[PDB]
A paper describes a structure:
The precursor PdDfsB is cleaved by subtilisin to yield biologically active Slf, and the chemical gradients of both proteins between two growing colonies could be accurately modelled. However, remarkably, the dfsB gene is widely distributed across Gram-positive and to some extent Gram-negative bacterial kingdoms (PFAM entry DUF1706). PdDfsB adopts a four-helical bundle core structure that belongs to the DinB structural superfamily. The most strongly conserved region of PdDfsB is the C-terminal helix, which is present within the mature Slf sequence.
Numbering used by the authors: 3 to 170
Write the structure that this text describes.
């Protein structure tokens, strides 16, 4: 539930900064370590955010340029997000933690900029984006929440757990 652009932007920033801050103490040498019962490495964790946040921005970019938007992505389907994630890991996994963090910070700033340029109705009322219709009656802000606030929260838990369990 969000009432304003300011409220949404502030919640994204709050959850994003707590998430990113967890990577400060992680060694580059350990970025690919798979730890027991933790589904992703630090590098995979970041690549997942880079994937969805950039995909969100790309949906909007395609639609306002007048293009059809295949969601989640061309060649990928909602019933096979695992394959989509694999494309994320492959795409962003060739970069360091430092590099992935910088990219993600830039992508989140683009989200701030996007929210600012939306009209109130475009952000908060359904029926304004074709790409948002992918889930019936969801306004854009919901799509933004579930790809920023929500995963920055959940995957902060995952990366903290990774740090609790990673071997010396
Ligand atoms: Cl994980
Ligand atoms: K990895």
């Amino acid at each position: 539930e969000y009432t304003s652009k300011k409220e949404l932007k502030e919640e994204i920033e709050k959850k994003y900064e707590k998430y990113d801050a967890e990577f400060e103490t992680i060694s580059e040498s350990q970025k690919d370590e798979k730890v027991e019962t933790v589904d992703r490495t630090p590098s995979e964790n970041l690549s997942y955010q880079l994937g969805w946040v950039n995909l969100l921005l790309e949906w909007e970019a395609k639609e306002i340029a007048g293009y059809n938007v295949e969601t989640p992505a061309p060649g990928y389907k909602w019933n096979n997000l695992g394959g989509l994630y694999q494309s994320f890991y492959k795409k962003y996994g060739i970069y360091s933690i430092k590099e992935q963090r910088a990219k993600l910070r830039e992508a989140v700033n683009e989200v701030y900029k996007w929210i600012s340029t939306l009209s109130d109705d475009e952000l908060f009322q359904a029926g304004n984006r074709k790409w948002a219709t992918t889930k019936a009656m969801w306004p854009v802000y919901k799509w933004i929440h579930i790809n920023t606030v929500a995963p920055f929260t959940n995957f902060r838990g995952k990366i903290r757990k990774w740090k609790r369990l990673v071997p010396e």
